[PDB]
Design a protein around this ligand. Structure first.
Ligand SMILES: Cc1cc2nc3c(=O)[nH]c(=O)nc-3n(C[C@H](O)[C@H](O)[C@H](O)COP(=O)(O)O)c2cc1C
Ligand SMILES: Cc1cc2nc3c(=O)[nH]c(=O)nc-3n(C[C@H](O)[C@H](O)[C@H](O)COP(=O)(O)O)c2cc1C
Lengths: 187, 187
């Protein structure tokens, strides 16, 4: 019996966005376990701004219905079936949202915290062999989709995480050395 | 140098925001190494929107000066000394910033990537026994501060990381079960 002492550096660097999943079953209790660990994200004044909708199994069709009903007839003709088939061969979706504070600093802080929570989650999931992609784009800003999944105005969708077990890790893309993006002032 | 954690979950759960630092010196090369690990955050379209200014040693006085110059003479006289003493007993500050895309979607994605980069750095640093706090608030939105550090309009400061070795930190605050802020759509 050997316990492993993996540097979190390894997880951070090995994590990949995964967009295609095996038909292996993702346990709900595992996702809840991971999300609970993710809640240890920094968050100003302990506002804990993050909230979630988890769509799994038959429920995923409800999300799909909200997605499709939000498209113009042209988008829908283009991506409807494609996207429906994709969502339905993805074990879980997690819509991550927050109440939008009318004030810049508090909203930015909340959004920062909500992104830290999602990144935590992605790291936590990678560790157990779960892949995921953090989705954005115009769908998340579409008032038709937002009402369609039961959110009110002034609730912001930070991301939709698509999650499941996967066959092969996608390849990485080399990062720019931080020294090209930084000034050092030892002046 | 390496790690005694048996899970990344533990690093995530045990990380604390640290505000007071010991006088132990912090390696500039170490901070750069950690920053380079942090760049493995998700970032839509491989935009890598993060940029940094690292203030270390005598360089910190430049930062302190920018801060004090953004204050009224009243603030300066009252706070100025206690502020300098604190910054100058903080081994390092990193101002993390981005260029603002005129478009909401790309901008928010870039902000979220940058927040994910910063949370990565916090966890990477905790691993090495380095504490920090992500400072936000009005200083970062003050046009006199922003100019003072050499930033232009449309360059958003996402946080200032204050970083050092430490021997005390705030007690961890109990998190709200995620079950209290989620809905499961099972059918
Ligand atoms: C973007 C954002 C802004 C923050 N701003 C500040 C701040 O301005 N001043 C401060 O002392 N801490 C700041 N922190 C607060 C701590 O990160 C937060 O209180 C933390 O969650 C406290 O519990 P912790 O020890 O688990 O991190 C900020 C965190 C986030 C993510
Ligand atoms: C806020 C944010 C939004 C993203 N949105 C999408 C998305 O809309 N669709 C997608 O395929 N990937 C999305 N990603 C992933 C990126 O497209 C990008 O390829 C990836 O993060 C870089 O590769 P990696 O995550 O495997 O390291 C997003 C990442 C971030 C941080």
């Amino acid at each position: 019996a050997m316990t492993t002492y993996t540097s979190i550096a390894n997880v951070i660097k090995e994590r990949r966005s995964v967009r295609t999943f095996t038909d292996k079953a993702v346990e709900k209790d595992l996702l809840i376990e991971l999300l609970n660990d993710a809640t240890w994200a920094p968050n100003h004044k302990h506002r804990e701004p993050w909230n979630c909708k988890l769509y799994i199994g038959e429920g995923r069709k409800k999300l799909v219905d909200a997605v499709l009903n939000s498209f113009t007839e042209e988008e829908r003709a283009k991506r409807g079936k494609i996207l429906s088939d994709r969502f339905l061969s993805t074990p879980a979706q997690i819509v991550v949202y927050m109440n939008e504070d009318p004030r810049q600093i508090q909203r930015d802080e909340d959004y920062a915290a909500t992104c830290a929570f999602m990144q935590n989650f992605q790291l936590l999931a990678w560790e157990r062999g779960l892949g995921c992609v953090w989705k954005s784009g115009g769908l998340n800003y579409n008032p038709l989709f937002i009402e369609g999944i039961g959110l009110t105005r002034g609730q912001r969708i930070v991301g939709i995480l698509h999650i499941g077990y996967f066959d092969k890790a996608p390849e990485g893309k080399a990062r720019t050395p931080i020294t090209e993006k930084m000034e050092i002032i030892e002046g």
